């Protein structure tokens, strides 16, 4: 398992155009396209993202692509912030896992105002964290999804995703 598999778990793959759990024009796996309400738009997106006048779809591979670009994006972003960094630094392969899928989801703006999750994580305060993540609209919103990456941050395990 890793953070590819696991991400590839929590998001799906649609190979034409969908929308995520916020009614947002999404493609692949769960490349955002636009926050806009229109088609139009997320297609026009869509093509300058992607190279190619689509009509809406992707292959396989496009697809991947972008996940590629966007997991990388992920990574990168958390290691420019601030907030971010030491704690990311500060913890284990598996639990670092769990942050990247969480700013993927997110954004490192929004995981970057979990501020005291943040501080517990960095304090090896995994119990409390759980709690304390588990206060909040995202897992209002998604409970499975986050429970399952709740579980991860807080055993360092993948149990949550065999
Ligand atoms: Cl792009
Ligand atoms: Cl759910
Ligand atoms: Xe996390
Ligand atoms: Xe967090």
């Known amino acids: 398992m890793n953070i590819f598999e696991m991400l590839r778990i929590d998001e799906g793959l649609r190979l ?7 009614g ?23 093509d300058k993202a992607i190279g190619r006048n689509t ?3 992707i292959t396989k591979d496009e697809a991947e692509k972008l996940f590629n670009q966007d997991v990388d994006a ?3 972003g958390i290691l420019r912030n601030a907030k971010l960094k030491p704690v990311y630094d500060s913890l284990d392969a598996v639990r670092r896992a769990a942050l990247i ?3 993927f989801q997110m ?11 943040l501080r517990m994580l960095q304090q090896k305060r995994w119990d409390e964290a759980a709690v304390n993540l588990a206060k909040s609209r ?4 998604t409970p499975n999804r986050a429970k399952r990456v709740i579980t ?9 995703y065999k």
């Open 16 to 22: 034409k155009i969908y929308k995520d759990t916020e």
């Open 24 to 46: 947002y024009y999404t493609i692949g796996i769960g490349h955002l396209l636009t926050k806009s309400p229109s088609l139009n738009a997320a297609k026009s997106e869509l």
């Open 55 to 57: 009509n809406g779809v």
């Open 74 to 76: 992920a990574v990168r």
């Open 101 to 103: 899928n969480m700013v």
């Open 107 to 117: 954004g490192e703006t929004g995981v970057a105002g979990f501020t005291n999750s």
């Open 138 to 141: 995202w897992y209002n919103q």
């Open 152 to 160: 991860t941050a807080r055993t360092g395990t993948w149990d949550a």
